Amino acid sequence: GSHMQSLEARLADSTAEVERLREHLEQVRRDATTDGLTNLANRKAFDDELDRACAEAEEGGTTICLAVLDIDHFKGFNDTWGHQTGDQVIRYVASVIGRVAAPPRFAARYGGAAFAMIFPREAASVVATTLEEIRVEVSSRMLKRRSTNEDLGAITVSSGFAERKPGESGHSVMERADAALYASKRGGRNRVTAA
Amino acid sequence: QSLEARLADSTAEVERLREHLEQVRRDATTDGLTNLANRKAFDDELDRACAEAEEGGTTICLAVLDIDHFKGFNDTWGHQTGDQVIRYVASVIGRVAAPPRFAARYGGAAFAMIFPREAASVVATTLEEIRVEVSSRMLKRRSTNEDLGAITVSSGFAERKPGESGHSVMERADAALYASKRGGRNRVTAA
Ligand SMILES: Nc1nc2c(ncn2[C@@H]2O[C@@H]3COP(=O)(O)O[C@H]4[C@@H](O)[C@H](n5cnc6c(=O)[nH]c(N)nc65)O[C@@H]4COP(=O)(O)O[C@H]3[C@H]2O)c(=O)[nH]1
Ligand SMILES: Nc1nc2c(ncn2[C@@H]2O[C@@H]3COP(=O)(O)O[C@H]4[C@@H](O)[C@H](n5cnc6c(=O)[nH]c(N)nc65)O[C@@H]4COP(=O)(O)O[C@H]3[C@H]2O)c(=O)[nH]1
Ligand SMILES: Nc1nc2c(ncn2[C@@H]2O[C@@H]3COP(=O)(O)O[C@H]4[C@@H](O)[C@H](n5cnc6c(=O)[nH]c(N)nc65)O[C@@H]4COP(=O)(O)O[C@H]3[C@H]2O)c(=O)[nH]1
């Protein structure tokens, strides 16, 4: 009777705003973690996912590899063509990586013009060839400046990757993969290296 | 009648999430190094203000600022100092961008600002004040108490022509900034 029924009407209007918000919360959260320019994850979403995936590798005793990519000479590139064309080069490289990073792989915009990738349960030989396919894919086509149709020159990426040692943490693997990338850059750029 | 216990629990998850949702919203639109807006929140805000400036037949100006020789700061003093240089310049831009103005950290060590319904002359002198301001003081390294060097800001801006899209104004503002850098840095130029 009545008061029992004034309550079921308030609890239905209340557990419905729970779902109206919990669904709206999921889509604000998806976009809070999506790097707007490229539609990949951002460094934050990546550093969270890299830690969660290292738990799954220690507790499960499985494999995980990690890769970093930088767009070569990207600073002097912006100065030549302008912020807007540079944003289009970032987008383009990001399209090449996103194609290849279907889950359980995880790809992110790790920096200003840098990317990070997670290959869970995959051997390094696979990672090493995936990065090599991405390297030539990126420099395969000649891109054009959109109003004027100029050649932008080839676009190349340097690359670093490493395999997580048994006791290694997220931060630590990243440190090593980053040393790998610096090694690729100081060795002539447009190449992959590994520890 | 366990019912009053589930409605006390149900008007609680509404309070937990409605607050949590506004918190996630703020963080999706704020650069937590400088507390200005981030790039998404700006590009969205630019489209709103170019829409409203066309409906209202009124104008808006647009400014881009980059910190000069910023990479050399990270390299000499460390990334921990570099964040302080960004915070410092952002703070100058912040004191000066009270609403209806709108400042954000576009890109890496760059900023973008919206001046709606403002005379180009005032925007130009506002930017020039920002320029003398950041270079007015000689900052010291927190730990070791040493002169970090001069800090200067380059700057470019443009006013929106009547048919222009937000994309297009920023391209002009960006060309203006490239002229400032190419012409000696530490200055303001405009189309
Ligand atoms: N301590 C500290 N250092 C920071 C921070 N953010 C960026 N930096 C550092 O500053 C370097 C130079 O950035 P820049 O002078 O703004 O010059 C940047 C910028 O002009 C450009 N860039 C960055 N993001 C974008 C973008 O979304 N679009 C376009 N077109 N260009 C971008 O690439 C240039 C190179 O950037 P990177 O290679 O990533 O290298 C960056 C990065 O290592 C920070 O919060 N704290
Ligand atoms: N009078 C005075 N006020 C102080 C002092 N230390 C902190 N404050 C106040 O506290 C604010 C926060 O500074 P922060 O959190 O270190 O964050 C700072 C810091 O990261 C960077 N920054 C500004 N000036 C310097 C500097 O001289 N050296 C270094 N290393 N960083 C600076 O800019 C950020 C924003 O600073 P502000 O907007 O200026 O605002 C500063 C300033 O208003 C001080 O020694 N004297
Ligand atoms: N935590 C904190 N400490 C404060 C604050 N204001 C002053 N101090 C302390 O008091 C000393 C005197 O600083 P000042 O007279 O403001 O004179 C300052 C100020 O004119 C300038 N300065 C240094 N840091 C900042 C800063 O973060 N923001 C601003 N706006 N100015 C600064 O450098 C001078 C020397 O600063 P220091 O050698 O670091 O030594 C500073 C600092 O240790 C504050 O708001 N918060």
Side-chain angles (χ1 to χ4, degrees), chain A residues 48-67:
Chain A
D48 284 324
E49 170 66 89
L50 173 62
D51 275 336
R52 181 201 79 63
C54 281
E56 188 174 333
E58 197 77 66
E59 304 163 358
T62 177
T63 332
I64 230 156
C65 297
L66 183 86

PDB file of all heavy atoms in Angstrom, chain A residues 48-67:
ATOM      1  N   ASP A  48      48.664   3.532 -17.186  1.00  0.00           N
ATOM      2  CA  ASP A  48      47.745   2.689 -16.425  1.00  0.00           C
ATOM      3  C   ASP A  48      47.665   1.287 -17.019  1.00  0.00           C
ATOM      4  O   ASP A  48      47.773   0.291 -16.298  1.00  0.00           O
ATOM      5  CB  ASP A  48      46.350   3.320 -16.377  1.00  0.00           C
ATOM      6  CG  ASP A  48      46.262   4.492 -15.413  1.00  0.00           C
ATOM      7  OD1 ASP A  48      46.918   4.454 -14.345  1.00  0.00           O
ATOM      8  OD2 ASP A  48      45.525   5.454 -15.725  1.00  0.00           O
ATOM      9  N   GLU A  49      47.462   1.188 -18.334  1.00  0.00           N
ATOM     10  CA  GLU A  49      47.296  -0.123 -18.951  1.00  0.00           C
ATOM     11  C   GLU A  49      48.587  -0.936 -18.908  1.00  0.00           C
ATOM     12  O   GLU A  49      48.536  -2.165 -18.778  1.00  0.00           O
ATOM     13  CB  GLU A  49      46.796   0.048 -20.386  1.00  0.00           C
ATOM     14  CG  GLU A  49      46.805  -1.213 -21.244  1.00  0.00           C
ATOM     15  CD  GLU A  49      45.830  -2.284 -20.769  1.00  0.00           C
ATOM     16  OE1 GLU A  49      44.658  -2.268 -21.217  1.00  0.00           O
ATOM     17  OE2 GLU A  49      46.242  -3.149 -19.960  1.00  0.00           O
ATOM     18  N   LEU A  50      49.746  -0.274 -18.995  1.00  0.00           N
ATOM     19  CA  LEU A  50      51.021  -0.986 -18.930  1.00  0.00           C
ATOM     20  C   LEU A  50      51.235  -1.613 -17.560  1.00  0.00           C
ATOM     21  O   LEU A  50      51.800  -2.707 -17.450  1.00  0.00           O
ATOM     22  CB  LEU A  50      52.173  -0.037 -19.262  1.00  0.00           C
ATOM     23  CG  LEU A  50      53.606  -0.550 -19.098  1.00  0.00           C
ATOM     24  CD1 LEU A  50      53.837  -1.716 -20.027  1.00  0.00           C
ATOM     25  CD2 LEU A  50      54.636   0.545 -19.360  1.00  0.00           C
ATOM     26  N   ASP A  51      50.800  -0.933 -16.502  1.00  0.00           N
ATOM     27  CA  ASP A  51      50.927  -1.499 -15.166  1.00  0.00           C
ATOM     28  C   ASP A  51      49.974  -2.673 -14.978  1.00  0.00           C
ATOM     29  O   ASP A  51      50.371  -3.725 -14.464  1.00  0.00           O
ATOM     30  CB  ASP A  51      50.682  -0.417 -14.113  1.00  0.00           C
ATOM     31  CG  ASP A  51      51.939   0.385 -13.793  1.00  0.00           C
ATOM     32  OD1 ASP A  51      53.053  -0.145 -14.003  1.00  0.00           O
ATOM     33  OD2 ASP A  51      51.815   1.539 -13.323  1.00  0.00           O
ATOM     34  N   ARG A  52      48.714  -2.515 -15.400  1.00  0.00           N
ATOM     35  CA  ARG A  52      47.748  -3.603 -15.280  1.00  0.00           C
ATOM     36  C   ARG A  52      48.194  -4.826 -16.070  1.00  0.00           C
ATOM     37  O   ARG A  52      48.022  -5.964 -15.617  1.00  0.00           O
ATOM     38  CB  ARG A  52      46.365  -3.153 -15.750  1.00  0.00           C
ATOM     39  CG  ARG A  52      45.317  -4.253 -15.622  1.00  0.00           C
ATOM     40  CD  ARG A  52      44.089  -4.040 -16.508  1.00  0.00           C
ATOM     41  NE  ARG A  52      44.309  -4.410 -17.909  1.00  0.00           N
ATOM     42  CZ  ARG A  52      44.601  -5.639 -18.334  1.00  0.00           C
ATOM     43  NH1 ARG A  52      44.739  -6.629 -17.463  1.00  0.00           N
ATOM     44  NH2 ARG A  52      44.770  -5.877 -19.630  1.00  0.00           N
ATOM     45  N   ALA A  53      48.773  -4.612 -17.251  1.00  0.00           N
ATOM     46  CA  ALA A  53      49.216  -5.725 -18.080  1.00  0.00           C
ATOM     47  C   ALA A  53      50.493  -6.378 -17.563  1.00  0.00           C
ATOM     48  O   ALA A  53      50.771  -7.525 -17.927  1.00  0.00           O
ATOM     49  CB  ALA A  53      49.416  -5.258 -19.523  1.00  0.00           C
ATOM     50  N   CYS A  54      51.276  -5.681 -16.732  1.00  0.00           N
ATOM     51  CA  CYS A  54      52.436  -6.313 -16.109  1.00  0.00           C
ATOM     52  C   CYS A  54      52.040  -7.195 -14.936  1.00  0.00           C
ATOM     53  O   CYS A  54      52.735  -8.173 -14.639  1.00  0.00           O
ATOM     54  CB  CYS A  54      53.438  -5.261 -15.645  1.00  0.00           C
ATOM     55  SG  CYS A  54      54.470  -4.593 -16.963  1.00  0.00           S
ATOM     56  N   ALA A  55      50.944  -6.859 -14.252  1.00  0.00           N
ATOM     57  CA  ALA A  55      50.380  -7.775 -13.268  1.00  0.00           C
ATOM     58  C   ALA A  55      49.952  -9.079 -13.930  1.00  0.00           C
ATOM     59  O   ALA A  55      50.292 -10.170 -13.459  1.00  0.00           O
ATOM     60  CB  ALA A  55      49.199  -7.116 -12.556  1.00  0.00           C
ATOM     61  N   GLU A  56      49.215  -8.982 -15.039  1.00  0.00           N
ATOM     62  CA  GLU A  56      48.790 -10.166 -15.776  1.00  0.00           C
ATOM     63  C   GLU A  56      49.970 -10.989 -16.279  1.00  0.00           C
ATOM     64  O   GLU A  56      49.807 -12.182 -16.558  1.00  0.00           O
ATOM     65  CB  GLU A  56      47.895  -9.741 -16.945  1.00  0.00           C
ATOM     66  CG  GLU A  56      47.211 -10.874 -17.701  1.00  0.00           C
ATOM     67  CD  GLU A  56      46.235 -10.361 -18.759  1.00  0.00           C
ATOM     68  OE1 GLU A  56      45.700  -9.243 -18.583  1.00  0.00           O
ATOM     69  OE2 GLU A  56      46.009 -11.071 -19.767  1.00  0.00           O
ATOM     70  N   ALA A  57      51.152 -10.385 -16.392  1.00  0.00           N
ATOM     71  CA  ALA A  57      52.335 -11.106 -16.847  1.00  0.00           C
ATOM     72  C   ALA A  57      53.118 -11.727 -15.704  1.00  0.00           C
ATOM     73  O   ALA A  57      53.788 -12.746 -15.904  1.00  0.00           O
ATOM     74  CB  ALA A  57      53.255 -10.178 -17.645  1.00  0.00           C
ATOM     75  N   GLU A  58      53.059 -11.136 -14.512  1.00  0.00           N
ATOM     76  CA  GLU A  58      53.716 -11.738 -13.358  1.00  0.00           C
ATOM     77  C   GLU A  58      52.828 -12.800 -12.718  1.00  0.00           C
ATOM     78  O   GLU A  58      53.265 -13.934 -12.498  1.00  0.00           O
ATOM     79  CB  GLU A  58      54.088 -10.656 -12.342  1.00  0.00           C
ATOM     80  CG  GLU A  58      55.113 -11.100 -11.311  1.00  0.00           C
ATOM     81  CD  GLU A  58      56.529 -11.128 -11.862  1.00  0.00           C
ATOM     82  OE1 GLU A  58      57.060 -10.047 -12.203  1.00  0.00           O
ATOM     83  OE2 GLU A  58      57.108 -12.233 -11.956  1.00  0.00           O
ATOM     84  N   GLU A  59      51.571 -12.449 -12.425  1.00  0.00           N
ATOM     85  CA  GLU A  59      50.661 -13.395 -11.785  1.00  0.00           C
ATOM     86  C   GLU A  59      50.369 -14.582 -12.693  1.00  0.00           C
ATOM     87  O   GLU A  59      50.203 -15.711 -12.217  1.00  0.00           O
ATOM     88  CB  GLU A  59      49.361 -12.690 -11.395  1.00  0.00           C
ATOM     89  CG  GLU A  59      49.554 -11.477 -10.492  1.00  0.00           C
ATOM     90  CD  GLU A  59      48.333 -10.563 -10.453  1.00  0.00           C
ATOM     91  OE1 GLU A  59      47.338 -10.859 -11.156  1.00  0.00           O
ATOM     92  OE2 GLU A  59      48.375  -9.546  -9.722  1.00  0.00           O
ATOM     93  N   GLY A  60      50.297 -14.348 -14.002  1.00  0.00           N
ATOM     94  CA  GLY A  60      50.060 -15.408 -14.957  1.00  0.00           C
ATOM     95  C   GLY A  60      51.303 -16.044 -15.527  1.00  0.00           C
ATOM     96  O   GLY A  60      51.210 -17.080 -16.193  1.00  0.00           O
ATOM     97  N   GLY A  61      52.468 -15.455 -15.277  1.00  0.00           N
ATOM     98  CA  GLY A  61      53.710 -15.987 -15.818  1.00  0.00           C
ATOM     99  C   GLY A  61      53.745 -16.038 -17.330  1.00  0.00           C
ATOM    100  O   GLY A  61      54.176 -17.046 -17.904  1.00  0.00           O
ATOM    101  N   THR A  62      53.291 -14.974 -17.990  1.00  0.00           N
ATOM    102  CA  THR A  62      53.235 -14.901 -19.443  1.00  0.00           C
ATOM    103  C   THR A  62      54.165 -13.794 -19.946  1.00  0.00           C
ATOM    104  O   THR A  62      54.801 -13.078 -19.167  1.00  0.00           O
ATOM    105  CB  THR A  62      51.789 -14.697 -19.914  1.00  0.00           C
ATOM    106  OG1 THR A  62      51.759 -14.546 -21.340  1.00  0.00           O
ATOM    107  CG2 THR A  62      51.162 -13.474 -19.254  1.00  0.00           C
ATOM    108  N   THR A  63      54.241 -13.663 -21.270  1.00  0.00           N
ATOM    109  CA  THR A  63      55.181 -12.767 -21.930  1.00  0.00           C
ATOM    110  C   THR A  63      54.545 -11.416 -22.253  1.00  0.00           C
ATOM    111  O   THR A  63      53.324 -11.286 -22.393  1.00  0.00           O
ATOM    112  CB  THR A  63      55.712 -13.395 -23.222  1.00  0.00           C
ATOM    113  OG1 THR A  63      55.682 -14.824 -23.110  1.00  0.00           O
ATOM    114  CG2 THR A  63      57.141 -12.933 -23.485  1.00  0.00           C
ATOM    115  N   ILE A  64      55.406 -10.403 -22.377  1.00  0.00           N
ATOM    116  CA  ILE A  64      54.976  -9.064 -22.765  1.00  0.00           C
ATOM    117  C   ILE A  64      56.158  -8.285 -23.336  1.00  0.00           C
ATOM    118  O   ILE A  64      57.265  -8.287 -22.782  1.00  0.00           O
ATOM    119  CB  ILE A  64      54.302  -8.336 -21.581  1.00  0.00           C
ATOM    120  CG1 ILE A  64      52.957  -7.757 -22.018  1.00  0.00           C
ATOM    121  CG2 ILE A  64      55.168  -7.230 -20.993  1.00  0.00           C
ATOM    122  CD1 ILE A  64      51.998  -7.556 -20.875  1.00  0.00           C
ATOM    123  N   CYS A  65      55.937  -7.652 -24.482  1.00  0.00           N
ATOM    124  CA  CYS A  65      56.942  -6.835 -25.136  1.00  0.00           C
ATOM    125  C   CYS A  65      56.393  -5.433 -25.327  1.00  0.00           C
ATOM    126  O   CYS A  65      55.178  -5.210 -25.355  1.00  0.00           O
ATOM    127  CB  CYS A  65      57.366  -7.415 -26.488  1.00  0.00           C
ATOM    128  SG  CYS A  65      58.154  -9.039 -26.398  1.00  0.00           S
ATOM    129  N   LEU A  66      57.317  -4.495 -25.486  1.00  0.00           N
ATOM    130  CA  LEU A  66      57.025  -3.077 -25.373  1.00  0.00           C
ATOM    131  C   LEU A  66      57.854  -2.326 -26.401  1.00  0.00           C
ATOM    132  O   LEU A  66      59.056  -2.579 -26.517  1.00  0.00           O
ATOM    133  CB  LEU A  66      57.352  -2.596 -23.961  1.00  0.00           C
ATOM    134  CG  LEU A  66      57.062  -1.148 -23.613  1.00  0.00           C
ATOM    135  CD1 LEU A  66      55.622  -1.017 -23.162  1.00  0.00           C
ATOM    136  CD2 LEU A  66      58.021  -0.733 -22.533  1.00  0.00           C
ATOM    137  N   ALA A  67      57.223  -1.406 -27.137  1.00  0.00           N
ATOM    138  CA  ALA A  67      57.891  -0.687 -28.211  1.00  0.00           C
ATOM    139  C   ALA A  67      57.600   0.808 -28.135  1.00  0.00           C
ATOM    140  O   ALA A  67      56.508   1.229 -27.742  1.00  0.00           O
ATOM    141  CB  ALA A  67      57.469  -1.227 -29.580  1.00  0.00           C
TER     142      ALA A  67
END
